[PDB]
Amino acid sequence: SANEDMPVERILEAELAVEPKTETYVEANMGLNPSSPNDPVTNICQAADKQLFTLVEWAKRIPHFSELPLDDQVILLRAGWNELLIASFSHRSIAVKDGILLATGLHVHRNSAHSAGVGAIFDRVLTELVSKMRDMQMDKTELGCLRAIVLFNPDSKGLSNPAEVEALREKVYASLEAYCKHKYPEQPGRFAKLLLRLPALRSIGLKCLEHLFFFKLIGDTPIDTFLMEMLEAPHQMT
Amino acid sequence: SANEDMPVERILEAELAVEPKTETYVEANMGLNPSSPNDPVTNICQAADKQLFTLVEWAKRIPHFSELPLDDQVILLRAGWNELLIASFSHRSIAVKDGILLATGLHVHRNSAHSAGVGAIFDRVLTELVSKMRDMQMDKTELGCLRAIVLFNPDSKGLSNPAEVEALREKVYASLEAYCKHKYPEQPGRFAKLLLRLPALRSIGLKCLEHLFFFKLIGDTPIDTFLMEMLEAPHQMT
Ligand SMILES: C[C@H](CCC(=O)NCCC[N+](C)(C)CCCS(=O)(=O)[O-])[C@H]1CC[C@H]2[C@@H]3[C@H](O)C[C@@H]4C[C@H](O)CC[C@]4(C)[C@H]3C[C@H](O)[C@]12C
Ligand SMILES: C[C@H](CCC(=O)NCCC[N+](C)(C)CCCS(=O)(=O)[O-])[C@H]1CC[C@H]2[C@@H]3[C@H](O)C[C@@H]4C[C@H](O)CC[C@]4(C)[C@H]3C[C@H](O)[C@]12C
Ligand SMILES: C[C@H](CCC(=O)NCCC[N+](C)(C)CCCS(=O)(=O)[O-])[C@H]1CC[C@H]2[C@@H]3[C@H](O)C[C@@H]4C[C@H](O)CC[C@]4(C)[C@H]3C[C@H](O)[C@]12C
Ligand SMILES: C[C@H](CCC(=O)NCCC[N+](C)(C)CCCS(=O)(=O)[O-])[C@H]1CC[C@H]2[C@@H]3[C@H](O)C[C@@H]4C[C@H](O)CC[C@]4(C)[C@H]3C[C@H](O)[C@]12C
Ligand SMILES: C[C@H](CCC(=O)NCCC[N+](C)(C)CCCS(=O)(=O)[O-])[C@H]1CC[C@H]2[C@@H]3[C@H](O)C[C@@H]4C[C@H](O)CC[C@]4(C)[C@H]3C[C@H](O)[C@]12C
Ligand SMILES: C[C@H](CCC(=O)NCCC[N+](C)(C)CCCS(=O)(=O)[O-])[C@H]1CC[C@H]2[C@@H]3[C@H](O)C[C@@H]4C[C@H](O)CC[C@]4(C)[C@H]3C[C@H](O)[C@]12C
Ligand SMILES: C[C@H](CCC(=O)NCCC[N+](C)(C)CCCS(=O)(=O)[O-])[C@H]1CC[C@H]2[C@@H]3[C@H](O)C[C@@H]4C[C@H](O)CC[C@]4(C)[C@H]3C[C@H](O)[C@]12C
Ligand SMILES: C[C@H](CCC(=O)NCCC[N+](C)(C)CCCS(=O)(=O)[O-])[C@H]1CC[C@H]2[C@@H]3[C@H](O)C[C@@H]4C[C@H](O)CC[C@]4(C)[C@H]3C[C@H](O)[C@]12C
What we know:
The structure is a homodimer.
Chain A: H1 8-17, H2 22-30, H3 40-60, H4 70-91, E1 99-101, E2 107-109, H5 110-116, H6 119-135, H7 140-151, H8 162-183, H9 190-195, H10 198-211, H11 213-232
Helix pairs in contact in A: 1-7, 3-4, 3-11, 4-6, 4-7, 4-10, 5-6, 6-10, 7-8
Bound molecules: 3-[(3-cholamidopropyl)dimethylammonio]-1-propanesulfonate (8 copies).
The site of one 3-[(3-cholamidopropyl)dimethylammonio]-1-propanesulfonate has 5 residues of chain A, from helix 2.
Family (chains A, B): Belongs to the nuclear hormone receptor family. NR2 subfamily.
GO biological process, one term (chains A, B): peroxisome proliferator activated receptor signaling pathway
GO molecular function, one term (chains A, B): identical protein binding
């Protein structure tokens, strides 16, 4: 266990860098200061784009990640994006109840996901991840370290050097325990409690891929506001 | 962290109780001392039955499990059987190479699984679990504690008291760390390395359910030996 090879402060920085601005959260949910038009395709493409940025800007800021062969960096991001995205929108949603806050600042309510056909996956996110993170008062350093552990997956298919990725993973969890021990001495089993949210992240990630949850999650509100305009507009042709 | 509420010795006992006898391994693979006939249905039903016994006899021997409401005991076994079964046949296969040893003592070779249509799931078992367990020289106490952590899943749907199951889970991993620390002081990050095999167990378990891997794994050899007899028998009707 050591913090020099994997500083938790440098891991917290990576998480803070990609954190949405307060103005993003406010604008999205008030419909204010739109850059974007009421076109569903544009809005979906912009949301996907903002999510990709969050994952890539975060990863590059993780210690030693950019020292891996570029081929391995692509494989790790492509193999873990689903889980990385889920862990990120789960922790961001701790303050909110019955909903998810996306990288665009948008709040997707439980009800919208239930009418969208993704209700059960959404409830698994709320229950298995969001509630659990809120109860332990999981901090952004802990999230950061959980996400770097997901990132540094030595089991990803196609890696040139799996031993390097595995050595990088070990350092993250060695720093995570040192951090947990020093900040939460009253909680001796917190490190395990954190690592034990990863199997749920794994199953949820697979279930999201099978149901087009990412597509429906980012596509639902843009479809609603577009239809709202058409329904609110006056009578048309013939 | 404490061993009185969850003794690792009592957890090792549970694993040892359900461990196949040497005579089972020898008889299965030599075709010797058959109780069973060359009927595929009987052989599949007997294998499923032996696997169920292993899971139930193991669980009852786990400290405090039988003190949970009986309704919760059923839910925990039904929710985690797939993962419990996989962790069990993975560790049993450490000594063998390119194959899996079942509770019936039977050795299913990689090649048979490839011709059966389950090749990729089988290779994931060999690579993600079997190899990893063999490299760390994972002991039966460690396996036992990993399996009780899977057993005591507080996220299972329908539990009357999820807090009790979660409290039981915490004790297992508290004992597991104390064990790891005391037996492997040269390996300070072993406890994490062990807990980090659980997300792979989770994904593999889901993939096994979607491809009828348990059905095909136990059904393949009984179908082969039945067809072998028919093909080896002399010419028949008209
Ligand atoms: C005070 C808090 C945040 C605290 C903070 O962190 N403050 C840094 C500077 C805040 N901003 C980044 C928004 C400045 C934008 C300058 S920009 O050049 O980008 O327009 C900010 C964040 C978003 C702001 C609201 C939204 O805007 C929507 C709306 C626009 C109207 O018109 C005026 C009213 C209203 C309700 C705003 C009030 C207030 O002010 C809010 C709540
Ligand atoms: C801000 C206003 C609501 C104001 C309001 O009506 N506020 C008082 C409520 C108080 N109550 C009567 C409930 C009593 C509370 C008692 S209690 O004790 O329970 O607190 C709400 C009502 C309809 C909302 C829009 C639509 O959705 C469509 C769209 C969805 C997107 O996603 C975000 C953008 C957008 C344009 C939304 C923006 C905004 O969000 C609107 C204007
Ligand atoms: C565009 C309309 C406003 C009504 C309208 O139809 N107004 C005319 C066009 C306005 N424009 C600014 C595009 C003009 C540009 C001219 S220019 O020549 O500069 O291109 C506004 C009002 C509510 C806005 C949505 C919500 O917030 C929720 C959500 C937040 C995400 O974060 C981005 C996606 C999404 C779906 C938002 C999209 C868009 O933002 C909406 C539909
Ligand atoms: C109909 C409601 C106002 C009614 C109200 O009081 N909202 C309180 C919340 C309670 N509900 C949502 C249940 C009310 C439903 C309608 S009810 O008839 O029940 O009141 C108003 C308030 C804000 C309005 C949107 C924004 O301008 C942005 C955007 C501009 C585009 O150019 C056209 C589309 C869009 C999405 C607009 C649609 C619609 O025009 C909204 C939702
Ligand atoms: C010495 C080792 C295991 C060491 C051990 O743990 N020894 C405890 C007693 C062993 N058994 C449980 C098998 C006794 C069965 C008594 S029973 O009443 O169940 O038949 C035992 C385990 C299984 C035994 C083989 C198989 O049988 C198949 C075969 C049957 C023939 O005929 C004789 C040859 C052969 C190759 C056997 C030789 C030997 O002996 C083996 C390898
Ligand atoms: C024990 C004998 C093989 C003996 C043998 O032929 N032994 C010498 C090999 C030495 N070599 C020539 C390979 C050189 C090694 C050089 S090296 O340097 O590589 O070591 C093998 C050959 C065919 C096998 C059966 C069938 O499968 C069907 C069935 C499958 C079930 O699942 C288990 C039961 C059963 C009845 C099997 C039992 C047993 O298992 C048999 C009789
Ligand atoms: C039954 C045949 C032997 C040839 C035959 O067809 N022999 C006549 C019948 C013999 N019986 C003992 C059933 C008579 C009982 C009379 S009584 O009146 O008592 O019912 C034997 C030889 C090889 C044996 C398989 C392999 O090992 C692999 C595997 C191990 C598992 O662990 C159990 C399943 C499986 C598929 C085994 C089933 C069965 O075991 C086989 C086919
Ligand atoms: C054909 C082979 C022997 C040939 C040999 O030398 N085995 C070495 C291994 C190498 N191979 C598997 C590639 C050889 C394939 C056949 S080859 O023609 O290439 O030799 C022999 C050896 C043991 C025999 C089984 C047992 O009695 C149990 C059982 C009794 C039932 O009543 C009928 C079914 C069954 C499954 C029997 C089938 C078959 O009769 C086996 C596999």
